[model samples]
Target: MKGIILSGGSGTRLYPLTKVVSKQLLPVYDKPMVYYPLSVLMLAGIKDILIISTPEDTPRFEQLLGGGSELGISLSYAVQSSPDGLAQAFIIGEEFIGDDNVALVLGDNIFYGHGFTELLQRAANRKSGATIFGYNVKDPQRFGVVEFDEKGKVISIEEKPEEPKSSYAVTGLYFYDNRVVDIAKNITPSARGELEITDVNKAYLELGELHVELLGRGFAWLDTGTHESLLQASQFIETIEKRQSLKVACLEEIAYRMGYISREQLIKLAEPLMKNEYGQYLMNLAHR
Candidate 1:
């Protein structure tokens, strides 16, 4: 499967701070925000990835991640042109996606949980339908809410409704079969005149091909789009790392742990930055 990180946006929500930089490039703690979602894909064992960003920010994303070869993966970049919609990623990345199933993750979304890799890999390895996640949140009205029947089957999904039917909100992560390309193409734009990802999932539901995974109390799913939430996410990561002495979303460490890079290769990647604790962490991993 291919991975697509939709990092496109003007980021007006984070004014002056994001004024000069892409929001995805902002630090979520010790690493760029994009690293969080990128780490998710890497954890899922995806090797070929495409990052979709605004034309103004695409070059910097390329500069930040390079060709992904160093991480033992393939990285390609694309321009979103406009903040058209999340589903537009399929249209923009059509060539890169080809016949492979795809996973789309919002660059600003951060996910951390015990056994999360297992959930990711399960979704990534699926063969028949679209898979999305549901997280119980206090503010479901601000997100796409999913409701289920007594039989535990998903019955409906509503996007930011004034009255939410359930407390479970659809997360920014999604997995879909190759049929998503045509599904995305055929859906009409919402009243807001933009292609809506919720619409795409709704299409899958209508066809009886939608699957929803629930993220329980052990998980942390953060949307760092606002100043307050940004700080909260950073604090969340800092607290976890400080308590456990293990970094969260440390890309190089993950790549190495997953056997994407050899110990020698990791040492090579760690040497130049020996001055910092981050590099030291990588060095320590190499010994272990």
Candidate 2:
């Protein structure tokens, strides 16, 4: 399977900061925001990734991630010339996503907490249909609202209705079978002229092939879209990392622990940044 990170949006919410570069490149705390989403895919055990970014910005991502080989992954890049829709990433990556299951995550969405690796691994192992997440939020109307059945079964999906019936809102990460390409192709654009990911999920739901997992109390999902949310996300990471003496979304550490590289390789990666606390933590892992 392949993992695709959509970092193509105009990022108007971020204003002047994004005018110089894509919002995914913005700092969440000590690291770039894209690392969080990228790390999520890696934890899912995905080794082949394709990043979709705006044409002007794809070059920077290529320079930043660089073939993904340094981390023991095969990374490639694509250009999304327009801000069409989230579902359009599958269409844009039709060739890259060919004949295999795929996972798509928004580059700006930051997901954290325990048991997340297990959740993503399970989704990565899916043999059919689509698997999505329903993250509980107080204001479901601001996002895509998802409804659940009495017995905990899912797939009843709704996009931001006038009155939200459930607090479980659909998050940006998704796992889908190869049929998603065709499903995305057939979906009609909304009144706003953008292809809707909800429509793609709705198609799978109608086929009784959509599975929704609810993220409970222990999990954290941060959509760093607005300035306020961005600051909150930064503080959240800073607070947690300082409290536990652990760094969140450390890619080199994740790569080493996943057996993607040897301990010697991890040490080499850490040595360059060893003067800093984050680098020192990675060095400690190398010793372990």
Candidate 3:
């Protein structure tokens, strides 16, 4: 499967900070925010990835990630052009997606949990339909909420419903089959004048092909769109890393351990930044 990171948006919620740089490029803690989602795709064993960003920010992502060859992945980019809708990524990345299944992750969404790798790999291996994650949130009205039956089957999905049936909200991560391209193309834009991803899932549901996996307690799913959320995400990362004495979303270390980059390559990559704790951690990995 191929991975798509949707990093486009006006980022109005972030105000002046986003005015200077893409929100995805902002630091979540010690690493850029985009690294978290990118690390997710990498850990899922996806080798071909497409980053969809605004015209002004695409170059920066390319510069940071290169062609992805250094990490054993093929990295390509596309312009979202506008905040037309989250589901538009399927349409924009049609060529890159080809006949393969695809995973779409919001660049600003960060997910951390013990079983994430296993869950991601399971999603990647799915043969049909769409797979989406549902996280229990305190404010379901602010998200795409999923209502599931007692058997854990999704019965309905409502986008920011005033009266939500469940506390579970659909996270930004999604996995879909090739039919998503045509589905996204056929859907009409919402009242907000953007093609809605929730609509795409609704289509899958109509066909009895939608699956929902709940990200229960012990998992962290953060949406760093607003200033408060941004700060909270940074704080969460700092606390976790400091407590565990391990880097969260450390790309160089992840790459080397996952066999995408050799140990020597990881050491070389760490050398330039060795003055910092992150670099020292990478160097220590080499010794281990």
- Arrange candidates, best TM-score first: 1, 2, 3
lDDT of 3 by residue, 1-288 (tens): 899999988888787988866899888978889999999988887878999999999999999889987676789999988889998999999999999999999998999999999999899889899999999999999999999998988899988998999999999999999899999999999989989999999999999999998998999998797888889999999999888868888877778878998998988887998999878998999889
* Residue 77 lDDT, candidate 1, scale 0-100: 94
Residue range 1-288, candidate 2, lDDT tens digits: 799999979889899999889999999999999999999999999999999999899999888878988799999999999998998999999999989999999999899988899999999999899999889998899888888888777736777888987889999999999999999989988987889999999998898888998899789999698999999999999999988867889998899989998898888888998899778988999887
lDDT over C-alpha atoms for residue 106 of model 1: 95
Per-residue CA lDDT of model 1 for 1-288, tens digit only, reads 999999988789999888887899999888999999999999998999999999889999999999988899999999998998899999999999999899999998999999999999999999889999999999999999999887768999999989999999999999999999999989888998789999999999998989999999889998797999999999999999998969998989989988998999999999997999989998988888
> Candidate 3: which pairs clash?
none
In order, candidate lDDTs are 0.93, 0.90, 0.91
- TM-score-superior candidate, 1 or 3: 1
**What's the C-alpha lDDT at position 200 in model 3?**
96
lDDT leaderboard ranking? 1, 3, 2
Worst 10 residues of 2 by lDDT: 151-160
TM-score of 1: 0.98
After superposing all C-alphas onto the true structure, candidate 3 shows an RMSD in angstroms of 1.2
